Amino acid sequence: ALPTPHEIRNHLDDYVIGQEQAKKVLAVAVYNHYKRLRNGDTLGKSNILLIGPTGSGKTLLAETLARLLDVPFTMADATTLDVENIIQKLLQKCDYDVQKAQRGIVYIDEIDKISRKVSGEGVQQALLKLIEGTLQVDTSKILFICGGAFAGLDKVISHRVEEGELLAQVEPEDLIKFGLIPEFIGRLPVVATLNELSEEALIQILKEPKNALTKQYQALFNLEGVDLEFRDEALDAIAKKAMARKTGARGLRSIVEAALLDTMYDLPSMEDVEKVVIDESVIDGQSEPLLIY
Amino acid sequence: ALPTPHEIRNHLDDYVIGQEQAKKVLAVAVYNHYKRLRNGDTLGKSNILLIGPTGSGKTLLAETLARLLDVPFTMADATTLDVENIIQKLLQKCDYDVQKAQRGIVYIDEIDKISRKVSGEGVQQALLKLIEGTLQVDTSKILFICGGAFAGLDKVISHRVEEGELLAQVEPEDLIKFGLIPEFIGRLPVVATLNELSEEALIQILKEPKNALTKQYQALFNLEGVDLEFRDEALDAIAKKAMARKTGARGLRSIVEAALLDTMYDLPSMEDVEKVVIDESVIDGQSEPLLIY
Amino acid sequence: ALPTPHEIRNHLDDYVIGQEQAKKVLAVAVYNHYKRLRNGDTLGKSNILLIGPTGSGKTLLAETLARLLDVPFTMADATTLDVENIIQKLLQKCDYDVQKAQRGIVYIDEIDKISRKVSGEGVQQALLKLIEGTLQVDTSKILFICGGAFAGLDKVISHRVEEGELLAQVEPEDLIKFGLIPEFIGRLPVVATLNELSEEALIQILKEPKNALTKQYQALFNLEGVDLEFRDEALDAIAKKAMARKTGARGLRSIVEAALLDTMYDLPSMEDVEKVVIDESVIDGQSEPLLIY
Amino acid sequence: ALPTPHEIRNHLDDYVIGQEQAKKVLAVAVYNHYKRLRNGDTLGKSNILLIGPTGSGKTLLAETLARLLDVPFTMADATTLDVENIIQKLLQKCDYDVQKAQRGIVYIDEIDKISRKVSGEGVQQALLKLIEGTLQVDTSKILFICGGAFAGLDKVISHRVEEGELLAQVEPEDLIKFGLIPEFIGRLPVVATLNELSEEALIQILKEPKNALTKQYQALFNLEGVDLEFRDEALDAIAKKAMARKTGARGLRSIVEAALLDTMYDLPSMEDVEKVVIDESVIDGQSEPLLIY
Amino acid sequence: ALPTPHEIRNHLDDYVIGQEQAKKVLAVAVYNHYKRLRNGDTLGKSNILLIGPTGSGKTLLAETLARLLDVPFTMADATTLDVENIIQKLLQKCDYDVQKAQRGIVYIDEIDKISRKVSGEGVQQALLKLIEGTLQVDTSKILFICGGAFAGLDKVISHRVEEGELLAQVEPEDLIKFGLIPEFIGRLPVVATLNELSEEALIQILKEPKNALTKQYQALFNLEGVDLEFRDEALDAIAKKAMARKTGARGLRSIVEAALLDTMYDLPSMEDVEKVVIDESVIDGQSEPLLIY
Amino acid sequence: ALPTPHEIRNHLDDYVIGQEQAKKVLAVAVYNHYKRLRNGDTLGKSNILLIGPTGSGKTLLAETLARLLDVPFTMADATTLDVENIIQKLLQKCDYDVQKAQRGIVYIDEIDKISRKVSGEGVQQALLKLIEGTLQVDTSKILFICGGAFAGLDKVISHRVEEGELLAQVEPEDLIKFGLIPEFIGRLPVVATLNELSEEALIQILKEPKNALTKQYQALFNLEGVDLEFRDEALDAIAKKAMARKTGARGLRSIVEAALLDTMYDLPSMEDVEKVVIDESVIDGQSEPLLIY
């Protein structure tokens, strides 16, 4: 039984934060893709193009969709572009089941990088042959999600319409001028755009997601018999630390690990009830976390 | 029993719109090719060269011909040019049946791109060896359709005769000056030219074809128990939207999907009789489609 | 029983027109080659170098010789130069029979193109190793015919002797200065030169050959129950049309096909005795061919 | 039973000298990695980035960790970058056991060398695909330690904070400006930095380690029945000799071998109790080592 | 039983003309090589370096030696330089018999071409590894003959000693300055030099050799029942014709074939006793050869 | 039973002349390497770096060591740098015995050539991976001897210390500045240096070695029943001849062969007691060698 786009967007809220619009677009595009396959067509390729800054959650979204639909997923990088190698990999994680491999999803990262603005354009066209569809499996059935930051894109759109509000006005012609070929863009009808993650959102990233850092460590400490408590001040501190380094959400783990290093070192050598991480432990880094016996 | 060129052109009208002349040329060229094969020659290679703007329907035509004659078809891109790889692929979709693979059709896209005006010319000659004919299958039997936009071609013809009226005056020498070698052009006797698709034709593209967008979605909505109605105003609106973006017919799906996004999102969560898409839903994009219970 | 050079030249007159001298040279060279093989040598390599403008009939001659002697034939292009690949191909069309593959003929096209005037010279020498002879088959036994237009050749010969009369004065040293290495030319003792095909010869090309265009179409129409009649005016018209385009004999089919397009389209939908193609049908292209019921 | 980070750092003191902080960081990072694997996650990649001058003991540390945890180890050089070849090698030393190969450790040397400040960045991204995880083994499970000297790094950090004290202030953004891509650095949360080895430490290097030079030779002489005695003066002499040549600890063996050459030459031809190496034997090199019968 | 150098030089006189000195050098070098092998060494590599103008008979000599000693022979071109490929080829013509393949001879042509005066020097060294000796066969046993024209060599020798008299003064240092590496020249102890073939020698080339042109054709005509007679005037005429074209002995066949073309054409269509070729038939080319019934 | 360094140096005196110091260094380094292996370590890699002019006897030494210890030996050229190919070759001459192949010796020639002063440095590092140790055989066990002339080395050492006396002052830092990477030099602790062979030594080279030229020929003549006598004058003459050509010891065979050519030619055709080579036979080359019946 296929999950309504509602159920899809709902489950996406459990792994990714914000980007509600993009999650609606993806939810619909996805539902329609598998709704179209399960009825043997008779229809739209329904291929998707994700346009959002780095560390916005594009890859996470693609993966999440795959899991939510218990469907064979595989990544690939447009820079390393062998095109059929992606397919054999999809079969590898699919137990070599042709049909289940056709229901699969394929995420291509850094698409904006192959925009000729020779070999690059050649890749667009070579990969394009897949998008259409031709191991004996056909690539017509599999859904394609093409991520990318598209740096210069924010500019071309502005030179026409006259960041989020600007990416909403995105048009296929903007992608053309950017460096993508028409025949390639025409294969990516569904364009979902993500916003740059907010700073408070950072805190939500450390908390809300079912795989948030705090939850992982609270679990690591949990199998130690110890309860880890992150005070909101500490979480805000981590957010700021991450912003000052411009590392976005990618530089969150590098902060938490460094903050809980000493504590995780001599933790198994202790007997106490819980450890409490205050802001003083993060920002200053000089103060040791509160210990409770 | 071979279908008369009439039957062929007739069935081509069911997938492609306009290009009636090109469909006559293709119909004849095709009929003669398979009429020549089924009589074991004793004759003309009867190979075809499609010359039309991008998104004119060249690829669609080639595919359509293949299906109409239940004959093994395969594409290939002149830019990615391994030459025999195309053949093995033709055998892949042919169940490795030598004879049926010889009856096959092969479409080569972006031929105008390999026109030297070194490696490019080398490809013309390498691919030329196939056109003639030499797995054990011979490539003499298979029909070759070479598509291409031929941008500069419109110019050279003008510098001689002194867009459609100009492409009709096309001559093998024009292709020579364009960048094609004589021995290669002499293998493509049949030259069918397509016109740039008209704007009203756009509307016909959304309606007439048996795989038109409207029909696909009406079907997607149909298995939902809902009847989708496209008012002509909405279709004209879509046409205009596509023209303003210069994306031609390639930018039609990107419009329809965006227009039916919200509706397809919360459709499975509703119970009503039919949805009616008005022009207000397309152009303005602000108005939601009419809902009927 | 080996055919006397007379019988050979006689049968060559049935496929190729003119080039009588070249056909004498080839006839002798060929007879001597197979007369030398059938007696296990004890002798001259008797390898041949064809020098004639494009579309003169070099390839046709080579093929014709092969068929006339029921001997395994295969082509190859000096531009695509893997050298032993030609051999395996010769075995492919020979049922992998070593001896019959040694009796084979090998035509190398565009030899004049590999004349260094690095890699090119390297090909001359690599291919030279074959010419001498070394799968287990030896390439000493097989006859080598190396075609080529040799554009600049007409000039060097003139700078020495001081087009046909000039190509008759051809000397190994002329080929040296052209761009061929001595050790390579010394392997091609037999040099047959062809003349540029005459305009009236064009008409003869449309008629005389046993595979002439007129005969093929008269046959295509023949299995339709219809008799096709080409009036000499129409044939002369076709000749002129071909000359104005400088496409030589390569641009003949492209004319005839275009002329019989409409007629072949609605032919199977008619019931009449014969169609007669007049000059008005070719030159003007406006007049439809005479129809007789 | 997993060894507490204490036990880990303790055993690391038996092979590597100094770098106590780095050994704490590595100990924790390691303990957490295998503590996370043995509980089937539910967590942090816990990948490590070693930043220390050449001959600081980075490679030694990685190897030591591997042995201490009886886990399949393999090296690889970022300059020679085939990416999956490292994996097959890890399987080679793992008896092709998928699970045990997933518990493995992989050290990548000269990471600072691939910092683009095209192909280099491509390697970062290609290797990045491994770090994440995709033979059928998944590379997500295996721990990655990326060594490197990072010459210019000492500078960029200084241009921000305004050698050890400077490397302690290291930040992900410093690595960014250095030449590493964000998505790559975000995969290396754990950053352990080593100091340039001290000169007295040199003496400790010749003595303390369980594989110290003195111990090896004392053993080589030991199976000769002879006791080798290194006087502290000789060890200090060796230290100085090594410093004057700037060869660091890499130029220690080249000194000891040269010092014990003559003695090891005519040793098996003697009968005595022990040989004693004085400073006079090292610095001067003129004096022969004390011999005792 | 090994043939004395006398017997060797004697048999060499039956295929090659002149170059008596070179034939003495080769005879000795060869006798010593196989005299050294048949006694399992205990000695000199006894490798040979042929230095003579093109078409002097270097390749012919090497081949002749091989046949005379019923030993597996194979050629190779220094320009096409895969090094072990030569070996597998030697095994191909040796029935894959290791020992008999070790007794083999290997001729390398155009050695003077690989003289660096990067890749070239690399080939010298790569091929050098063979010369020394390392399929399981060892290349130490096989004799190496390295031919070459060495154009500039005639000059360097002159700049030192201060063409035949000059090539006799050849020294290893001359080859060094020419472009050969010392370690390579030291592997070619035996240096045999050939003179530029004389013009009267040309006539001897057409007569004396057991494979002379006259003998081949007299045989071709012989199996026709006809006796071919070459008058000395005709042979001298052929010699002159060849000299005027500077094609040396390589341009002899190209003359004889052209002279006997017409006659060999209508020969099988005649009944007569013998044909006699006079000078008038060659030089003038206008007069037909004398026919006798 | 392992041979004491004395026995080793003693046997080395039977093949190589002079270089006594280098033979002591090699003897020790070797003894220690196999003394360390036969005791399963517990120790020093004990890898060797030969530094001597071309034709000094580096390769000869390496080979000699291998034979003396009945251990699998194989060469390799740093210029041709596939790295594991050397290993498979070592297994080829080792009957594919893993253990015996680990006891093997590997000589790398022209190491000084790969000194970057990109690909070159890459080879140093790739080959470095072997030196350390990782077919299933480990390369840690096998001994590595890296030869090389190191031309510029004589200079850098001079610019520091302020040819033999200079090469004795060699230091790892000198090799660094030369073009070798630290991590590579640290793997070659044992540095043995050879002197340029003396002119009188040349005579000793023709006499002393158990494979000296004189002994080989005296043996070649010996199986002829003839005694060959080299008068010291002739040997000195050969020495001078070799020096005038600067070919060193590499140009000795090229002299002796040329001197005994005629004599070896008509030797098997004679019956006499002995031939005596005087100086007149060598220098003048005009006088024939004394013959005694």
JSON list of N, CA and C in Angstrom, two decimals, chain E residues 1-14 27 68, chain F residues 265 269:
[
{"chain": "E", "resi": 1, "resn": "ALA", "atom": "N", "xyz": [75.01, -30.90, -35.92]},
{"chain": "E", "resi": 1, "resn": "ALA", "atom": "CA", "xyz": [76.37, -30.45, -36.20]},
{"chain": "E", "resi": 1, "resn": "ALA", "atom": "C", "xyz": [76.38, -28.99, -36.66]},
{"chain": "E", "resi": 2, "resn": "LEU", "atom": "N", "xyz": [77.10, -28.15, -35.92]},
{"chain": "E", "resi": 2, "resn": "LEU", "atom": "CA", "xyz": [77.18, -26.73, -36.24]},
{"chain": "E", "resi": 2, "resn": "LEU", "atom": "C", "xyz": [78.04, -26.46, -37.47]},
{"chain": "E", "resi": 3, "resn": "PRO", "atom": "N", "xyz": [77.54, -25.62, -38.38]},
{"chain": "E", "resi": 3, "resn": "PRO", "atom": "CA", "xyz": [78.25, -25.24, -39.60]},
{"chain": "E", "resi": 3, "resn": "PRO", "atom": "C", "xyz": [79.37, -24.25, -39.31]},
{"chain": "E", "resi": 4, "resn": "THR", "atom": "N", "xyz": [80.58, -24.56, -39.78]},
{"chain": "E", "resi": 4, "resn": "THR", "atom": "CA", "xyz": [81.71, -23.65, -39.61]},
{"chain": "E", "resi": 4, "resn": "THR", "atom": "C", "xyz": [81.36, -22.30, -40.23]},
{"chain": "E", "resi": 5, "resn": "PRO", "atom": "N", "xyz": [81.93, -21.22, -39.68]},
{"chain": "E", "resi": 5, "resn": "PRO", "atom": "CA", "xyz": [81.68, -19.87, -40.20]},
{"chain": "E", "resi": 5, "resn": "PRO", "atom": "C", "xyz": [81.86, -19.80, -41.71]},
{"chain": "E", "resi": 6, "resn": "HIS", "atom": "N", "xyz": [82.69, -20.67, -42.26]},
{"chain": "E", "resi": 6, "resn": "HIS", "atom": "CA", "xyz": [82.87, -20.76, -43.70]},
{"chain": "E", "resi": 6, "resn": "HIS", "atom": "C", "xyz": [81.57, -21.18, -44.38]},
{"chain": "E", "resi": 7, "resn": "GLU", "atom": "N", "xyz": [81.03, -22.31, -43.96]},
{"chain": "E", "resi": 7, "resn": "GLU", "atom": "CA", "xyz": [79.77, -22.82, -44.49]},
{"chain": "E", "resi": 7, "resn": "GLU", "atom": "C", "xyz": [78.69, -21.75, -44.36]},
{"chain": "E", "resi": 8, "resn": "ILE", "atom": "N", "xyz": [78.70, -21.04, -43.24]},
{"chain": "E", "resi": 8, "resn": "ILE", "atom": "CA", "xyz": [77.72, -19.98, -43.00]},
{"chain": "E", "resi": 8, "resn": "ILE", "atom": "C", "xyz": [77.84, -18.85, -44.01]},
{"chain": "E", "resi": 9, "resn": "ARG", "atom": "N", "xyz": [79.04, -18.30, -44.15]},
{"chain": "E", "resi": 9, "resn": "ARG", "atom": "CA", "xyz": [79.28, -17.23, -45.10]},
{"chain": "E", "resi": 9, "resn": "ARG", "atom": "C", "xyz": [79.00, -17.69, -46.53]},
{"chain": "E", "resi": 10, "resn": "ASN", "atom": "N", "xyz": [79.29, -18.96, -46.80]},
{"chain": "E", "resi": 10, "resn": "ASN", "atom": "CA", "xyz": [79.05, -19.53, -48.12]},
{"chain": "E", "resi": 10, "resn": "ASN", "atom": "C", "xyz": [77.57, -19.53, -48.48]},
{"chain": "E", "resi": 11, "resn": "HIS", "atom": "N", "xyz": [76.74, -19.98, -47.55]},
{"chain": "E", "resi": 11, "resn": "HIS", "atom": "CA", "xyz": [75.30, -20.02, -47.77]},
{"chain": "E", "resi": 11, "resn": "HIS", "atom": "C", "xyz": [74.69, -18.62, -47.81]},
{"chain": "E", "resi": 12, "resn": "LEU", "atom": "N", "xyz": [75.33, -17.68, -47.12]},
{"chain": "E", "resi": 12, "resn": "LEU", "atom": "CA", "xyz": [74.88, -16.29, -47.13]},
{"chain": "E", "resi": 12, "resn": "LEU", "atom": "C", "xyz": [75.13, -15.64, -48.49]},
{"chain": "E", "resi": 13, "resn": "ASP", "atom": "N", "xyz": [76.12, -16.15, -49.21]},
{"chain": "E", "resi": 13, "resn": "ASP", "atom": "CA", "xyz": [76.43, -15.65, -50.55]},
{"chain": "E", "resi": 13, "resn": "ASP", "atom": "C", "xyz": [75.35, -16.03, -51.55]},
{"chain": "E", "resi": 14, "resn": "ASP", "atom": "N", "xyz": [74.50, -16.98, -51.16]},
{"chain": "E", "resi": 14, "resn": "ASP", "atom": "CA", "xyz": [73.47, -17.50, -52.05]},
{"chain": "E", "resi": 14, "resn": "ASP", "atom": "C", "xyz": [72.16, -16.70, -51.97]},
{"chain": "E", "resi": 27, "resn": "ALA", "atom": "N", "xyz": [78.84, -14.38, -39.52]},
{"chain": "E", "resi": 27, "resn": "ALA", "atom": "CA", "xyz": [79.15, -15.81, -39.50]},
{"chain": "E", "resi": 27, "resn": "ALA", "atom": "C", "xyz": [79.85, -16.20, -38.21]},
{"chain": "E", "resi": 68, "resn": "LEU", "atom": "N", "xyz": [69.09, -20.78, -42.40]},
{"chain": "E", "resi": 68, "resn": "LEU", "atom": "CA", "xyz": [70.29, -21.60, -42.54]},
{"chain": "E", "resi": 68, "resn": "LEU", "atom": "C", "xyz": [70.55, -22.46, -41.31]},
{"chain": "F", "resi": 265, "resn": "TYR", "atom": "N", "xyz": [87.08, -17.24, -36.73]},
{"chain": "F", "resi": 265, "resn": "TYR", "atom": "CA", "xyz": [86.43, -17.54, -38.00]},
{"chain": "F", "resi": 265, "resn": "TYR", "atom": "C", "xyz": [87.03, -18.78, -38.64]},
{"chain": "F", "resi": 269, "resn": "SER", "atom": "N", "xyz": [88.73, -24.60, -38.86]},
{"chain": "F", "resi": 269, "resn": "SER", "atom": "CA", "xyz": [89.24, -25.09, -40.13]},
{"chain": "F", "resi": 269, "resn": "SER", "atom": "C", "xyz": [90.75, -25.34, -40.06]}
]
